[PDB]
Design a protein around this ligand. Structure first.
Ligand code: HEM
Ligand code: HEM
Ligand SMILES: CCN(CC)CCc1cc(F)c(F)c(OCc2cc(C)cc(N)n2)c1
Ligand SMILES: CCN(CC)CCc1cc(F)c(F)c(OCc2cc(C)cc(N)n2)c1
Ligand SMILES: C[C@H](O)[C@H](O)[C@H]1CNc2nc(N)[nH]c(=O)c2N1
Ligand SMILES: C[C@H](O)[C@H](O)[C@H]1CNc2nc(N)[nH]c(=O)c2N1
Ligand SMILES: [Zn+2]
Lengths: 414, 414
């Protein structure tokens, strides 16, 4: 029955939810791995034995959540999936069970700061899909829907669950919308250094690249374990926001822009023991992910160099904080540009206040809220946001999202 | 034999030191408390039984560190302290053992980012002290020495070790040099809200307060379990740095200043099982502790309000990032002001690079380096510094510094 304090308002909350926790963290009594990026307990193959308690555990919380726990409709659902796990050695989720499982994967994502919106998520059932073209069609309707003309809406599309393991549905993109990265002759990088491998994989499969900076990549969609195929999202569906500053008329000249929709596609959704290897999900951007991480990371776009140049800053001495100075202007510019186009974006102050507010109801109407401090605190201005001063308990509940290996290091190609 | 990666340069280091670890963290396999401020394993009473293995463990690493492990001088030291623990049920450290133990407490402090300097520490042996006046004298020589006319030097003064537990030496100040906090009639706070309780404890013991903002507090020194007594550090020893900005001539008008010497006094130093309840230690400031935390924390000096006012910023809308803007200027000003007075200060970029450099040698010439990410990453501009992208293993080695309760919630007053 542990306690977590906020050393800015002296607020104290009581976490009992951590007792329902199941998966492991990576920490022991004699070591803490809270700062390891991809721990082995966060990454993803299961059999028929363990598959039933996982179903039982899930079904029990789903009926506990509709004030119908243990009743007749529960006990028959229990025996029906029990029976079907005898028969098939797997089972199929109801439409309502999929919506619940998906929404609570988000709820349980301790590194997500946006989770105040977990209840308002739009679940698209793509479990009837059979072909890469079909996947492309479900994904286009996802992007159009979630984008909603800049009035962004939260959504997730769920392709059929893993079974044998070799007939797996996988989006090979890490996000549906990403800018291509190209290496140069001198080794330098054009576009986005992150994707330079993925960009070559797409050109390996015949992508004619318009070798520039902000080139939207094609989708690589793998259907039922078949070799993936290229598909180009209709440009009218990819909404982009050109970045301008509300003081600097030279800020246009920089020529930066960013896509409206953050939409992660390489993750695995885990419900009741069932594994959905493809399940792209989208929301809206917090400003810092673009303005701080995308733009100013060393091995990303890396623009602090030039923003300080046009600002004419003390770029000789480290202790002038010219980097800090150029970084705050870039984020004011991101926020302003997205806002002036009615494209949904949230600032790191408002999102961290909302999270503390979210954390409040989670400890009351639920008894806790798993949170990963290392990831919740924004990557700039840490301590002026209220989450820096809030203690958080991290633990692994299910349903959940997990990392998985990349398909090109596993897919038996042919 | 665990691995920790740097996701900005793809550097990988191998940590074997974590195996020598002894104390516990607070985390389990099913929960991570990496974000709890004062865990129960970090806070501090022991008997005679366990006291010998602690001596044995310590003495063995001390002789292992002088290429004289297991030799004659070792084995007799082993039996000599063994004998003396039979006799007294405690023991006394050699002068060389105290210097080693103290230096490695610093080395092992996973939340310290400055540890590149751990080998260069000046150890003052105050174990002959018997009276509060004597403590005051050792502390003044500490402050004069470590301050060195603004050319700051690292040092620590070690008062006699705990024994019975009721005759304990304790500095009641949290830092030797701190500004007083006073509450107002309207509830508001003048000076430093942190110390408002300690300021009243000093006035409880007869401090005539010059009720202002930056009033250096008196020392409250407790000697051999006796009631503590007030002492006023000679003002000529308290070096202060008036804060001015290298662009804004209105920055003087703010009227801020800060003491040169950070010097923590409320901690407990643990060596070979022996507990030193008073052991003030000083170094030099990283800029952010003043400019970010002292100045801009909500329940500290809280000046973002006024710095944005004189800067004339968009103080209506949160998403203008006026807070981020006023915060970078305050830190450029801190750095500049301290530097223009030849007073040693380090910026959060240089100190975090040095730490990564330090981490490098620690994994080579030692096999590891305990690090607490939550605390190492500076409280501003997190992700432009190289420690944000560095995985770190936190574990508890000894000798170490620990938190302890406050003496006014324990001291049997009379
Ligand atoms: C609605 C607005 C949302 C915002 C503002 C938001 C913001 C963020 C941010 C800043 C992160 C940190 C990761 C990083 O820095 O790259 C994150 C992580 C994450 N979010 Fe949210 N997100 C939103 C919606 C969603 C949705 C719709 C889902 C899924 C249904 C989701 C699930 C996750 C997951 C799984 C992670 C990563 C956890 C991990 O790395 O293990 N989020 N989000
Ligand atoms: C020489 C320059 C030094 C610098 C720049 C420095 C900087 C820092 C900073 C920024 C912190 C984070 C704590 C906070 O934000 O309040 C810290 C923590 C700490 N430092 Fe260092 N420090 C220095 C010297 C020392 C020395 C001389 C000692 C002791 C011999 C020491 C031991 C510690 C300890 C024990 C902690 C706190 C660990 C905890 O909270 O459990 N440091 N230091
Ligand atoms: C380990 C490598 N990193 C960087 C490539 C992974 C980053 C990452 C992994 C995930 F699983 C995520 F859900 C994730 O969501 C970012 C995000 C998602 C949404 C819907 C909205 C938003 N505003 N932001 C971001
Ligand atoms: C839990 C409450 N917090 C804030 C009051 C404790 C802060 C704190 C605790 C410690 F043990 C420390 F050693 C510490 O060192 C700050 C510091 C020390 C030195 C020598 C140099 C420097 N540049 N900085 C700071
Ligand atoms: C080393 C560390 O695990 C890694 O850099 C993490 C730190 N915290 C983060 N937090 C967020 N939100 N996103 C990130 O990519 C990271 N990176
Ligand atoms: C909630 C959290 O434990 C607390 O705010 C910590 C976070 N990290 C920190 N890191 C440093 N260096 N100093 C601090 O006071 C804190 N505060
Ligand atoms: Zn942990």
């Amino acid at each position: 029955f542990l306690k977590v304090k906020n050393w800015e308002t002296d607020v104290v909350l009581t976490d009992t939810l951590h007792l329902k926790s199941t998966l492991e963290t990576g920490c022991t009594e004699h070591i803490c791995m809270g700062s390891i990026m991809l721990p082995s307990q966060h990454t993803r193959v299961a059999t028929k034995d363990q598959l039933f308690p996982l179903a039982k555990e899930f079904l029990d919380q789903y009926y506990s959540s509709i004030k119908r726990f243990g009743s007749k409709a529960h006990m028959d659902r229990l025996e029906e999936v029990n029976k079907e796990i005898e028969s098939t050695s797997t089972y199929q989720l109801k439409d309502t069970e999929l919506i619940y499982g998906a929404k609570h994967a988000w709820r349980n994502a301790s590194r997500c700061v946006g989770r105040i919106q977990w209840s308002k998520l739009q679940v698209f059932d793509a479990r009837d899909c059979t072909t890469a073209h079909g996947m492309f069609n479900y994904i286009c309707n996802h992007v159009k829907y979630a984008t909603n003309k800049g009035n962004l809406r939260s959504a997730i599309t769920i392709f059929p669950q893993r079974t044998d393991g070799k007939h797996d549905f996988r989006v090979w993109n890490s996000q549906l919308i990403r800018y291509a990265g190209y290496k140069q002759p001198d080794g330098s990088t054009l576009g986005d250094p992150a994707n330079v491998q993925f960009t070559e994989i797409c050109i390996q499969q015949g992508w004619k690249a318009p070798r520039g900076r902000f080139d939207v990549l094609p989708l690589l969609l793998q259907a039922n374990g078949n070799d993936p195929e290229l598909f180009q999202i209709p440009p009218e569906l990819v909404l982009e926001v050109p970045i301008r500053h509300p003081k600097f008329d030279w800020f246009k000249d920089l020529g930066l822009k960013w896509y409206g929709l953050p939409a992660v596609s390489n993750m695995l959704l885990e419900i009741g023991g069932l594994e959905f290897s493809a399940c792209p999900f989208s929301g809206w951007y917090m400003g810092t992910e673009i303005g701080v991480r995308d733009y100013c990371d060393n091995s990303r776009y890396n623009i602090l160099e030039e923003v300080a140049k046009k600002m004419d800053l003390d770029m000789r001495k480290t202790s002038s904080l010219w980097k800090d100075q150029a970084l705050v202007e870039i984020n004011i510019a991101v926020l302003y540009s997205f806002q002036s186009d009615k494209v949904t974006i949230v600032d790191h102050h408002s999102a961290t206040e909302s999270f503390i507010k979210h954390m409040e109801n989670e400890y009351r109407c639920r008894g806790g809220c798993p949170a990963d401090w290392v990831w919740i605190v924004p990557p700039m201005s840490g301590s002026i946001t209220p989450v820096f001063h809030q203690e958080m308990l991290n633990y692994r509940l299910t349903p959940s999202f997990e990392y998985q290996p990349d398909p090109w290091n596993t897919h038996v190609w042919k």
